[PDB]
Design goal:
Blueprint: H1 13-16, E1 29-30, E2 36-37, E3 44-47, E4 53-58, E5 63-67, E6 75-78, E7 85-94, E8 105-106, E9 113-121, H2 127-130, E10 137-146, H3 154-159, E11 169-171, E12 187-192, E13 203-208, E14 212-214, H4 216-222, E15 253-254
Parallel strand pairs: 1-8, 2-15, 10-13, 10-14
Antiparallel strand pairs: 3-6, 4-5, 4-11, 5-7, 6-7, 7-9, 9-10, 12-13, 12-15
Bound molecules: ligand N8A and zinc ion (ZN).
PDB class: metal binding protein, lyase
Keywords: Inhibitor, metal binding protein, Lyase
Assembly: monomeric
């Protein structure tokens, strides 16, 4: 099964998922100088006031905080998007060291981690149908750098001991994802893919310019999770990031100058 180890990591994924060598794969390096400012890009609309988190799950490749997406409770609109996209889950990718961990890079710079808030286009009715469409998902990507703590992340950090191993889930209600957002919603955007198998080319990527800062203790607790299931040999869940993929025939647009 695919993973991030020596024999099943990202360079192996194309054998099971040939779209890995596709024309709109993610993540990518964001060359800030080559990104073009687009004045027709609208500001992003993040409407998270009514979000209903339900639980948190270790799926063996990251942990997902899952939301009730059966109504327009937490939605993303505006920006490059047409229509309304509902938040279904968020998760992170992170490194074994503070110097790596993000999937997107900015002028080749790697951040300590990257948060992905995953949304699906309501015109397709549910997530499973949306991922089959070229405009099915909008993923809001937010970089994490190590510095001061992010208070809004602590409730996530504190529950991770209850989902250490693959397959464990925990009730995780009343979590407000607004506590994970930076001050500015300036963004880059490009058409891309899921960054884990099945690598489907269904994502409008919206990557925020401004990182959030989290503490060293906060990211250290991510690194205590396990890829393995309980009662299997312990392999720390670290470096669960795919490296940058060829931009090919794509242009990254910026909402700011
Ligand atoms: N890392 S990412 O590009 O934000 C992202 C977002 C939503 C996703 O469903 C995935 N991929 C993922 O979760 N793979 C395991 C479950 C899955 C997801 C989609 C279709 C089939 N199976 C990646
Ligand atoms: Zn992701």
């Amino acid at each position: 099964h695919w993973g991030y180890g020596k024999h099943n990591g990202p360079e192996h994924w194309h054998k099971d998922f040939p779209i890995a060598k596709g024309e709109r794969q993610s993540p990518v390096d964001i060359d800030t100088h080559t990104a073009k400012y687009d004045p027709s890009l609208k500001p992003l609309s993040v409407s998270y006031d009514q979000a209903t988190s339900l639980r948190i799950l270790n799926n063996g490749h990251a942990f997902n905080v899952e939301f009730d997406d059966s109504q327009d409770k937490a939605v993303l609109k505006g920006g490059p998007l047409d229509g309304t996209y509902r938040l279904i889950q968020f998760h992170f990718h992170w490194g074994s060291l503070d110097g790596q961990g993000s999937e997107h890079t900015v002028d080749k710079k790697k951040y300590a981690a990257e948060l992905h808030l995953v949304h699906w286009n309501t015109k397709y009715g549910d997530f499973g149908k949306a991922v089959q469409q070229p405009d099915g998902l909008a993923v809001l990507g937010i970089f994490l750098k190590v510095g001061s703590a992010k208070p809004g992340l602590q409730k996530v950090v504190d529950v991770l001991d209850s989902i250490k191993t693959k397959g464990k889930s925990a009730d995780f209600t009343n979590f407000d994802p607004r506590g994970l957002l930076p001050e500015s919603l300036d963004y880059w955007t490009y058409p891309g893919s899921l960054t884990t198998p099945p690598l489907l080319e269904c994502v409008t990527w919206i990557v925020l310019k401004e990182p959030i800062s989290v503490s060293s203790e906060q990211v250290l607790k991510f690194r205590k999770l396990n890829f393995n299931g309980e009662g299997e040999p312990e392999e720390l869940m670290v470096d669960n990031w795919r490296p940058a993929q060829p931009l090919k025939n794509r242009q990254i647009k910026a909402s700011f100058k």
